CSV table of C-alpha atoms and ligand atoms in Angstrom, one decimal:
chain,number,residue,atom,x,y,z
A,1,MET,CA,49.3,31.4,-68.5
A,2,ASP,CA,45.7,31.6,-69.5
A,3,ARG,CA,42.6,31.7,-67.3
A,4,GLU,CA,42.1,27.9,-67.3
A,5,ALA,CA,45.7,27.4,-66.2
A,6,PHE,CA,45.4,30.1,-63.6
A,7,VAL,CA,42.3,28.6,-62.0
A,8,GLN,CA,43.8,25.1,-62.0
A,9,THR,CA,47.1,26.1,-60.3
A,10,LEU,CA,45.6,28.7,-58.0
A,11,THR,CA,43.1,26.2,-56.6
A,12,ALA,CA,46.0,23.8,-55.8
A,13,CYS,CA,47.9,26.5,-53.8
A,14,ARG,CA,48.9,25.5,-50.3
A,15,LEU,CA,51.4,28.3,-49.4
A,16,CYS,CA,49.8,29.7,-46.2
A,17,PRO,CA,49.8,27.0,-43.4
A,18,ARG,CA,47.2,28.8,-41.3
A,19,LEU,CA,44.9,29.3,-44.2
A,20,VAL,CA,45.2,25.8,-45.8
A,21,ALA,CA,44.2,24.5,-42.4
A,22,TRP,CA,41.4,27.0,-41.7
A,23,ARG,CA,39.7,26.8,-45.1
A,24,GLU,CA,39.1,23.1,-44.4
A,25,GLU,CA,38.7,23.3,-40.6
A,26,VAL,CA,35.6,25.6,-40.9
A,27,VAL,CA,33.8,23.1,-43.1
A,28,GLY,CA,30.8,22.1,-41.0
A,29,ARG,CA,31.6,24.5,-38.2
A,30,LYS,CA,28.4,26.4,-38.9
A,31,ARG,CA,25.5,24.1,-38.3
A,32,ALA,CA,23.3,26.2,-40.6
A,33,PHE,CA,25.3,25.0,-43.6
A,34,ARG,CA,26.6,21.7,-42.2
A,35,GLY,CA,26.1,19.0,-44.8
A,36,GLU,CA,26.4,21.5,-47.6
A,37,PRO,CA,29.2,21.2,-50.1
A,38,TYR,CA,32.2,23.4,-49.3
A,39,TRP,CA,34.7,24.7,-51.9
A,40,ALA,CA,37.3,24.9,-49.1
A,41,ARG,CA,40.1,26.0,-51.5
A,42,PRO,CA,41.5,29.2,-52.9
A,43,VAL,CA,38.8,31.3,-54.5
A,44,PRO,CA,39.2,32.2,-58.2
A,45,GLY,CA,37.9,35.6,-59.3
A,46,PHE,CA,34.5,35.9,-60.9
A,47,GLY,CA,33.1,38.1,-63.7
A,48,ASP,CA,33.7,39.5,-67.1
A,49,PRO,CA,37.0,38.3,-68.5
A,50,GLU,CA,37.1,41.6,-70.5
A,51,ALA,CA,36.2,43.7,-67.5
A,52,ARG,CA,36.8,47.5,-67.4
A,53,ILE,CA,36.1,47.6,-63.7
A,54,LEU,CA,37.7,45.4,-60.9
A,55,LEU,CA,36.3,45.2,-57.4
A,56,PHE,CA,39.0,44.1,-55.0
A,57,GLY,CA,38.0,42.7,-51.6
A,58,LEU,CA,40.1,41.5,-48.7
A,59,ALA,CA,39.6,37.8,-48.3
A,60,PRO,CA,37.0,35.0,-48.5
A,61,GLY,CA,34.4,34.5,-45.7
A,62,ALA,CA,34.6,31.1,-44.0
A,63,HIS,CA,31.0,30.4,-44.9
A,64,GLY,CA,30.8,32.7,-47.9
A,65,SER,CA,33.0,32.2,-50.9
A,66,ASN,CA,35.0,29.5,-49.0
A,67,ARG,CA,31.7,27.6,-49.1
A,68,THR,CA,30.2,28.6,-52.4
A,69,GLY,CA,33.4,29.0,-54.5
A,70,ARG,CA,32.4,32.4,-55.8
A,71,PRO,CA,33.6,35.8,-54.5
A,72,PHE,CA,31.3,37.4,-51.8
A,73,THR,CA,28.7,34.7,-52.4
A,74,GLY,CA,26.9,33.1,-49.5
A,75,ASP,CA,27.5,35.7,-46.8
A,76,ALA,CA,26.6,39.2,-45.7
A,77,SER,CA,29.0,40.9,-48.1
A,78,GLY,CA,27.4,39.4,-51.2
A,79,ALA,CA,23.9,40.1,-49.8
A,80,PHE,CA,24.9,43.7,-49.8
A,81,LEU,CA,27.1,43.9,-52.9
A,82,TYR,CA,25.3,41.9,-55.6
A,83,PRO,CA,22.0,43.7,-55.3
A,84,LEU,CA,23.8,47.0,-55.7
A,85,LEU,CA,25.8,45.8,-58.7
A,86,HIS,CA,22.5,45.1,-60.3
A,87,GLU,CA,21.0,48.5,-59.4
A,88,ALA,CA,24.0,50.2,-60.8
A,89,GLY,CA,23.4,48.4,-64.1
A,90,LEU,CA,26.4,46.1,-63.9
A,91,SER,CA,24.8,42.7,-63.6
A,92,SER,CA,22.1,40.4,-64.9
A,93,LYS,CA,20.3,39.9,-61.6
A,94,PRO,CA,20.3,41.0,-57.9
A,95,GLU,CA,21.2,37.7,-56.3
A,96,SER,CA,24.3,35.5,-56.6
A,97,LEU,CA,24.1,31.8,-56.0
A,98,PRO,CA,26.6,29.1,-57.0
A,99,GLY,CA,25.6,27.4,-60.3
A,100,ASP,CA,23.3,30.2,-61.4
A,101,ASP,CA,23.3,32.2,-64.6
A,102,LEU,CA,24.5,35.5,-63.1
A,103,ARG,CA,26.7,37.5,-65.4
A,104,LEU,CA,28.5,40.8,-64.7
A,105,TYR,CA,28.7,43.5,-67.3
A,106,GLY,CA,32.3,44.7,-67.6
A,107,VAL,CA,33.1,43.9,-64.0
A,108,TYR,CA,35.3,41.3,-62.3
A,109,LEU,CA,35.4,40.4,-58.6
A,110,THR,CA,38.3,39.1,-56.6
A,111,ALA,CA,40.4,39.9,-53.4
A,112,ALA,CA,43.9,40.4,-52.1
A,113,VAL,CA,43.9,37.0,-50.2
A,114,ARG,CA,42.2,34.0,-51.7
A,115,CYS,CA,41.8,31.7,-48.8
A,116,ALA,CA,39.5,32.3,-45.8
A,117,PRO,CA,41.4,33.7,-42.8
A,118,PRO,CA,40.4,33.5,-39.2
A,119,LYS,CA,38.4,36.6,-38.1
A,120,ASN,CA,38.5,37.6,-41.8
A,121,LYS,CA,41.9,39.1,-41.0
A,122,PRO,CA,44.9,37.8,-43.1
A,123,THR,CA,48.4,38.4,-41.8
A,124,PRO,CA,51.0,40.6,-43.6
A,125,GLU,CA,52.8,37.4,-44.5
A,126,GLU,CA,49.7,35.8,-46.1
A,127,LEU,CA,49.0,39.1,-48.0
A,128,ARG,CA,52.6,39.1,-49.3
A,129,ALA,CA,52.2,35.5,-50.4
A,130,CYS,CA,48.9,35.8,-52.3
A,131,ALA,CA,50.3,38.9,-54.1
A,132,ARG,CA,51.8,36.4,-56.6
A,133,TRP,CA,48.2,35.4,-57.6
A,134,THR,CA,47.2,39.1,-57.8
A,135,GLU,CA,50.0,39.5,-60.4
A,136,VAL,CA,48.7,36.5,-62.4
A,137,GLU,CA,45.0,37.4,-62.1
A,138,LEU,CA,45.3,41.1,-62.9
A,139,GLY,CA,47.6,40.1,-65.8
A,140,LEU,CA,44.6,38.4,-67.4
A,141,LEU,CA,42.6,41.6,-67.2
A,142,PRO,CA,44.4,44.1,-69.4
A,143,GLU,CA,41.3,46.1,-70.2
A,144,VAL,CA,40.7,47.2,-66.6
A,145,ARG,CA,40.5,51.0,-66.3
A,146,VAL,CA,39.1,51.3,-62.7
A,147,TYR,CA,40.2,49.4,-59.6
A,148,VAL,CA,37.9,49.6,-56.6
A,149,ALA,CA,39.5,48.8,-53.3
A,150,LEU,CA,37.1,47.5,-50.7
A,151,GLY,CA,38.8,48.6,-47.5
A,152,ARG,CA,42.2,49.8,-46.4
A,153,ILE,CA,44.0,46.5,-46.7
A,154,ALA,CA,42.7,45.9,-50.2
A,155,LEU,CA,43.8,49.4,-51.1
A,156,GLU,CA,47.3,48.8,-49.7
A,157,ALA,CA,47.5,45.5,-51.7
A,158,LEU,CA,46.7,47.4,-54.9
A,159,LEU,CA,49.2,50.2,-54.1
A,160,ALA,CA,51.9,47.5,-53.6
A,161,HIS,CA,51.0,45.9,-56.9
A,162,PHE,CA,51.4,49.1,-58.8
A,163,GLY,CA,54.4,50.4,-56.9
A,164,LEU,CA,52.5,53.3,-55.3
A,165,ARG,CA,53.4,55.0,-51.9
A,166,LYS,CA,51.0,54.5,-49.0
A,167,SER,CA,51.7,58.0,-47.9
A,168,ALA,CA,50.5,59.7,-51.2
A,169,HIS,CA,47.4,57.5,-51.5
A,170,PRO,CA,45.7,57.5,-48.0
A,171,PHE,CA,42.7,55.4,-47.4
A,172,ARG,CA,39.3,57.0,-47.0
A,173,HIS,CA,35.9,56.2,-48.4
A,174,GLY,CA,35.5,58.0,-51.7
A,175,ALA,CA,39.2,58.5,-52.4
A,176,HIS,CA,40.1,58.7,-56.1
A,177,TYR,CA,43.6,58.4,-57.5
A,178,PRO,CA,44.3,58.8,-61.2
A,179,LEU,CA,47.0,56.5,-62.7
A,180,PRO,CA,49.0,56.8,-66.0
A,181,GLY,CA,47.2,55.6,-69.1
A,182,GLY,CA,43.7,56.8,-68.1
A,183,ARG,CA,43.4,54.3,-65.2
A,184,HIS,CA,41.8,55.0,-61.8
A,185,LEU,CA,42.0,53.7,-58.3
A,186,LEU,CA,38.9,54.2,-56.1
A,187,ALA,CA,38.6,53.4,-52.4
A,188,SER,CA,35.5,52.4,-50.5
A,189,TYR,CA,34.8,51.2,-47.0
A,190,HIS,CA,34.7,47.4,-47.0
A,191,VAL,CA,31.3,45.8,-47.5
A,192,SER,CA,31.7,43.7,-44.4
A,193,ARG,CA,28.8,43.2,-42.0
A,194,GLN,CA,30.3,45.6,-39.5
A,195,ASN,CA,30.3,48.6,-41.8
A,196,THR,CA,26.9,47.8,-43.4
A,197,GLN,CA,25.0,47.0,-40.2
A,198,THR,CA,26.2,50.1,-38.4
A,199,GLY,CA,25.5,52.3,-41.3
A,200,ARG,CA,29.1,53.4,-41.7
A,201,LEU,CA,28.7,52.3,-45.3
A,202,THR,CA,25.2,52.9,-46.6
A,203,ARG,CA,23.7,51.4,-49.7
A,204,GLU,CA,23.5,54.8,-51.3
A,205,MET,CA,27.2,55.4,-50.5
A,206,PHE,CA,28.2,52.2,-52.2
A,207,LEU,CA,26.0,52.8,-55.2
A,208,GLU,CA,27.7,56.1,-55.6
A,209,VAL,CA,31.1,54.4,-55.7
A,210,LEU,CA,29.8,52.0,-58.4
A,211,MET,CA,28.4,54.9,-60.4
A,212,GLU,CA,31.7,56.7,-60.3
A,213,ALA,CA,33.5,53.5,-61.4
A,214,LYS,CA,31.2,53.3,-64.3
A,215,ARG,CA,31.8,56.9,-65.3
A,216,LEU,CA,35.5,56.6,-65.0
A,217,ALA,CA,35.5,53.3,-67.0
A,218,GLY,CA,33.6,55.0,-69.8
A,219,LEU,CA,30.6,52.7,-69.1
B,301,DU,O1,30.2,39.0,-69.8
B,301,DU,C1,30.4,38.0,-69.0
B,301,DU,C2,30.7,36.7,-69.4
B,301,DU,C3,30.9,35.7,-68.5
B,301,DU,N1,30.8,35.9,-67.1
B,301,DU,C4,31.0,34.7,-66.1
B,301,DU,C5,29.6,34.5,-65.5
B,301,DU,C6,29.6,33.0,-65.3
B,301,DU,O2,30.4,32.6,-64.1
B,301,DU,C7,30.3,32.3,-66.5
B,301,DU,C8,29.4,32.2,-67.7
B,301,DU,O3,28.0,31.8,-67.3
B,301,DU,P1,26.8,31.6,-68.2
B,301,DU,O4,25.6,32.3,-67.7
B,301,DU,O5,26.5,30.2,-68.3
B,301,DU,O6,27.1,32.1,-69.6
B,301,DU,O7,31.3,33.4,-66.7
B,301,DU,C9,30.5,37.3,-66.6
B,301,DU,O8,30.4,37.6,-65.4
B,301,DU,N2,30.3,38.2,-67.6
B,302,SF4,S1,46.0,32.8,-49.4
B,302,SF4,FE1,46.8,32.8,-51.5
B,302,SF4,S2,48.9,32.3,-51.3
B,302,SF4,FE2,47.9,31.7,-49.4
B,302,SF4,S3,47.4,29.5,-49.7
B,302,SF4,FE3,45.6,30.7,-50.3
B,302,SF4,S4,45.9,31.0,-52.5
B,302,SF4,FE4,47.9,30.4,-51.7
């Protein structure tokens, strides 16, 4: 199927009972955004349809992409990620807001799970379920040369997708695994608030990951 079909069928998905309920249940839960329109549905990837770099997150934030409808947009993750994408020379502007004219240069953003999970922690069953969408979504991006896993779970999802052993591709910030055909898998700490607020993942550290992705992608 093409992108239009992918988005239409993905957004209708109701496979995970806990997530179908939660993505809607959280609407209005945060008073700060109560009254605001909520996507409250599976989140389609965002970016260059001819991307050479793919950033792979874990799952939507209840009041982030589950609210705005665009990956990482609306919460702490996007506040950290989007400005760095711009500094790395991979986007048109530092901020990401639904309905804006933001464009990514050869980069596409998505995640292993596409519906907001409680505690931002999907279950193995939910991860196994959404893998069907990872197959469809990555199938629409044949030009990708570098896959950047944001966190251990995202890395494991990519390893499963490519039939790679967890043992031989351990998770650590800065890990780099070459794949057949000049492709590359890069691992980074997730850009969640926990890692960024504590300093575990610094802005310079993430910019370094993006610069490496650019180099490896021939950008
Ligand atoms: O090179 C490209 C082309 C389109 N996109 C995405 C960005 C927007 O969501 C739409 C196009 O938005 P617009 O600014 O209206 O041309 O598709 C991108 O990220 N990079
Ligand atoms: S997480 Fe994925 S598989 Fe589960 S309901 Fe959402 S879109 Fe469907």
